[PDB]
Design an enzyme around this catalytic site. Structure first.
Site, PDB file in Angstrom:
ATOM      1  N   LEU A   1       0.860  -1.190   0.000  1.00  0.00           N
ATOM      2  CA  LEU A   1       0.000   0.000   0.000  1.00  0.00           C
ATOM      3  C   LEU A   1       0.911   1.262   0.000  1.00  0.00           C
ATOM      4  O   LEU A   1       0.759   2.158  -0.842  1.00  0.00           O
ATOM      5  CB  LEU A   1      -0.952   0.001   1.202  1.00  0.00           C
ATOM      6  CG  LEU A   1      -1.850  -1.226   1.433  1.00  0.00           C
ATOM      7  CD1 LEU A   1      -2.360  -1.255   2.882  1.00  0.00           C
ATOM      8  CD2 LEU A   1      -3.020  -1.247   0.464  1.00  0.00           C
ATOM      9  N   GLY A   2       1.896   1.260   0.906  1.00  0.00           N
ATOM     10  CA  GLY A   2       2.879   2.326   1.061  1.00  0.00           C
ATOM     11  C   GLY A   2       4.303   1.876   0.805  1.00  0.00           C
ATOM     12  O   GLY A   2       4.627   0.694   0.940  1.00  0.00           O
TER      13      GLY A   2
ATOM     14  N   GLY B   1       9.207   4.319   5.161  1.00  0.00           N
ATOM     15  CA  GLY B   1       8.713   2.998   5.544  1.00  0.00           C
ATOM     16  C   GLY B   1       7.626   2.418   4.650  1.00  0.00           C
ATOM     17  O   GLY B   1       6.855   3.148   4.020  1.00  0.00           O
ATOM     18  N   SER B   2       7.546   1.082   4.620  1.00  0.00           N
ATOM     19  CA  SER B   2       6.584   0.337   3.817  1.00  0.00           C
ATOM     20  C   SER B   2       5.347  -0.058   4.628  1.00  0.00           C
ATOM     21  O   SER B   2       5.477  -0.514   5.766  1.00  0.00           O
ATOM     22  CB  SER B   2       7.239  -0.914   3.247  1.00  0.00           C
ATOM     23  OG  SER B   2       7.237  -1.985   4.179  1.00  0.00           O
ATOM     24  N   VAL B   3       4.156   0.103   4.026  1.00  0.00           N
ATOM     25  CA  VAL B   3       2.868  -0.286   4.592  1.00  0.00           C
ATOM     26  C   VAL B   3       2.339  -1.383   3.673  1.00  0.00           C
ATOM     27  O   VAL B   3       2.202  -1.189   2.468  1.00  0.00           O
ATOM     28  CB  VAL B   3       1.885   0.907   4.766  1.00  0.00           C
ATOM     29  CG1 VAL B   3       0.545   0.450   5.362  1.00  0.00           C
ATOM     30  CG2 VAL B   3       2.508   1.985   5.634  1.00  0.00           C
TER      31      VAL B   3
ATOM     32  N   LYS C   1       2.941  -1.869   8.981  1.00  0.00           N
ATOM     33  CA  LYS C   1       4.021  -0.943   8.673  1.00  0.00           C
ATOM     34  C   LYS C   1       5.342  -1.363   9.290  1.00  0.00           C
ATOM     35  O   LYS C   1       5.396  -1.826  10.430  1.00  0.00           O
ATOM     36  CB  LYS C   1       3.671   0.491   9.088  1.00  0.00           C
ATOM     37  CG  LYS C   1       4.709   1.534   8.638  1.00  0.00           C
ATOM     38  CD  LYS C   1       4.260   2.933   8.869  1.00  0.00           C
ATOM     39  CE  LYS C   1       5.370   3.936   8.650  1.00  0.00           C
ATOM     40  NZ  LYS C   1       4.809   5.326   8.503  1.00  0.00           N
TER      41      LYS C   1
ATOM     42  N   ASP D   1       2.127  15.706   8.256  1.00  0.00           N
ATOM     43  CA  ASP D   1       1.886  15.253   6.894  1.00  0.00           C
ATOM     44  C   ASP D   1       0.402  15.181   6.557  1.00  0.00           C
ATOM     45  O   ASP D   1      -0.039  14.276   5.840  1.00  0.00           O
ATOM     46  CB  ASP D   1       2.634  13.950   6.570  1.00  0.00           C
ATOM     47  CG  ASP D   1       2.920  13.798   5.083  1.00  0.00           C
ATOM     48  OD1 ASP D   1       2.516  14.708   4.295  1.00  0.00           O
ATOM     49  OD2 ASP D   1       3.505  12.751   4.691  1.00  0.00           O
TER      50      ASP D   1
HETATM   51  C1  LIG Z   1      -0.708   5.658   5.220  1.00  0.00           C
HETATM   52  C2  LIG Z   1      -1.505   5.359   3.926  1.00  0.00           C
HETATM   53  C3  LIG Z   1      -2.857   6.067   4.105  1.00  0.00           C
HETATM   54  C4  LIG Z   1      -1.696   3.877   3.587  1.00  0.00           C
HETATM   55  N1  LIG Z   1      -2.180   3.038   4.665  1.00  0.00           N
HETATM   56  C5  LIG Z   1      -3.374   2.466   4.810  1.00  0.00           C
HETATM   57  C6  LIG Z   1      -3.849   2.128   6.094  1.00  0.00           C
HETATM   58  C7  LIG Z   1      -3.071   2.443   7.336  1.00  0.00           C
HETATM   59  N2  LIG Z   1      -3.428   1.842   8.466  1.00  0.00           N
HETATM   60  O1  LIG Z   1      -2.116   3.238   7.321  1.00  0.00           O
HETATM   61  C8  LIG Z   1      -5.087   1.440   6.178  1.00  0.00           C
HETATM   62  N3  LIG Z   1      -5.865   1.086   5.211  1.00  0.00           N
HETATM   63  N4  LIG Z   1      -5.390   1.433   3.972  1.00  0.00           N
HETATM   64  C9  LIG Z   1      -6.102   1.180   2.842  1.00  0.00           C
HETATM   65  C10 LIG Z   1      -5.375   1.648   1.776  1.00  0.00           C
HETATM   66  C11 LIG Z   1      -5.815   1.487   0.365  1.00  0.00           C
HETATM   67  C12 LIG Z   1      -5.413   2.389  -0.620  1.00  0.00           C
HETATM   68  C13 LIG Z   1      -5.907   2.288  -1.918  1.00  0.00           C
HETATM   69  C14 LIG Z   1      -6.793   1.280  -2.251  1.00  0.00           C
HETATM   70  C15 LIG Z   1      -7.195   0.375  -1.285  1.00  0.00           C
HETATM   71  C16 LIG Z   1      -6.714   0.476   0.013  1.00  0.00           C
HETATM   72  C17 LIG Z   1      -4.159   2.232   2.300  1.00  0.00           C
HETATM   73  C18 LIG Z   1      -4.194   2.090   3.689  1.00  0.00           C
HETATM   74  C19 LIG Z   1      -0.324   3.405   3.109  1.00  0.00           C
HETATM   75  C20 LIG Z   1       0.290   4.631   2.414  1.00  0.00           C
HETATM   76  C21 LIG Z   1      -0.775   5.738   2.570  1.00  0.00           C
HETATM   77  C22 LIG Z   1      -1.659   5.830   1.331  1.00  0.00           C
HETATM   78  N5  LIG Z   1      -0.069   7.037   2.620  1.00  0.00           N
END
Ligand SMILES: CC1(C)[C@H](Nc2c(C(N)=O)cnn3cc(-c4ccccc4)cc23)CC[C@]1(C)N
Length: 271
Positions: free
Chosen positions: A14-15, A16-18, A37, A131
């Site tokens: 989805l995303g 340090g790495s997420v 993360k 951020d």
């Molecule tokens: C910090 C975030 C907001 C993301 N982190 C996420 C978290 C979390 N706990 O940080 C939780 N749920 N989630 C869903 C998506 C996601 C995106 C597109 C499509 C489907 C699903 C992304 C994330 C990772 C990178 C980010 C985007 N900067």
């Protein structure tokens, strides 16, 4: 609150790495989906950076802040990761772009009010986000949003109101003197209001527009432009009242900017 690594099944990034993992203790593919993360960079400053992120989230209990589920447990010291909840709808940036047609001004205002109440709660706990952007806000459901990404978040000491640590979300003081505070979070909030009322359209994004108005280093030019009192324009079809609030969030001096507590009732009366 203590998840076994052997049961955290990788799905994607989805995303340090997420990462998106399934917490699957049964090993059957029916377990709940989690957001995990971890830092790729080993080190003592990095360990402290990630330890700080965990402590911050662990003590945050808002309906408008992404839920901390726990920490990971595996083979070695290196295996420890942060486990948060996963929100399938994803970030507000993509959601706004995918669902424009059904998201009206009252809906955008409902999100605005929720982000605000969440930012108001962060200040209450002495947390500067650093951020705040639509890309960092997640959609819980149709009428519910949460604040996420606590990697740059800093806790203010009891006797100080500021902290000295894309350029389009930074306040003028952050740009020139790297001063971060709840007052700089408010500036970023104005950019968030702008992002919301532009539906996160890329052709009128804070970057696309500020660069257009810009044309020495790019940061200096933006800061010159800001010193002159130039601002992002009102989004296409933006209710005038909403644009005035963004211009308060963008007051040159941090003392002049409204508080999150002060902005709250304003966004509520607007619906
Ligand atoms: C910090 C975030 C907001 C993301 N982190 C996420 C978290 C979390 N706990 O940080 C939780 N749920 N989630 C869903 C998506 C996601 C995106 C597109 C499509 C489907 C699903 C992304 C994330 C990772 C990178 C980010 C985007 N900067």
């Amino acid at each position: 609150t203590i998840f076994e690594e052997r049961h955290l099944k990788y799905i994607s990034q989805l995303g340090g790495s997420v990462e998106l993992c399934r917490y699957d203790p049964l090993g059957d593919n029916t377990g709940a989906l989690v957001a995990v993360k971890q830092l790729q960079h080993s080190g003592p400053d990095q360990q402290r950076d990630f330890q700080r992120e965990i402590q911050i989230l662990k003590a945050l209990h808002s309906d408008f802040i992404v839920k901390y589920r726990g920490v990971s447990y595996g083979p070695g010291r290196q295996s420890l990761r942060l486990v948060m909840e996963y929100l399938p709808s994803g970030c507000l940036r993509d959601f706004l772009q995918r669902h424009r047609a059904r998201l009206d001004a009252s809906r955008l205002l409902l999100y605005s009010s929720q982000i605000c109440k969440g930012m108001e709660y962060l200040g209450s706990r002495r947390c500067v986000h650093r951020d705040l952007a639509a890309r960092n806000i997640l959609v819980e459901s149709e009428a519910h949003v949460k604040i996420a990404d606590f990697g740059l978040a800093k806790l203010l000491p009891l006797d100080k109101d500021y902290y000295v640590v894309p350029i389009f979300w930074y306040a003028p003081e952050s740009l020139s003197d790297n001063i971060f505070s709840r007052q700089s979070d408010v500036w970023s909030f104005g950019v968030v209001l702008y992002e919301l009322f532009t539906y996160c359209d890329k052709s009128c994004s804070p970057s696309a527009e500020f660069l257009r108005m810009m044309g020495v280093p790019a940061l200096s030019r933006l800061l010159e432009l800001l010193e002159e009192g130039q601002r992002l324009p009102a989004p296409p079809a933006c209710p005038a009242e909403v644009h005035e609030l963004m211009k308060l969030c963008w007051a040159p001096s941090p003392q002049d900017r409204p508080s999150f507590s002060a902005l709250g009732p304003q966004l509520d009366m607007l619906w």
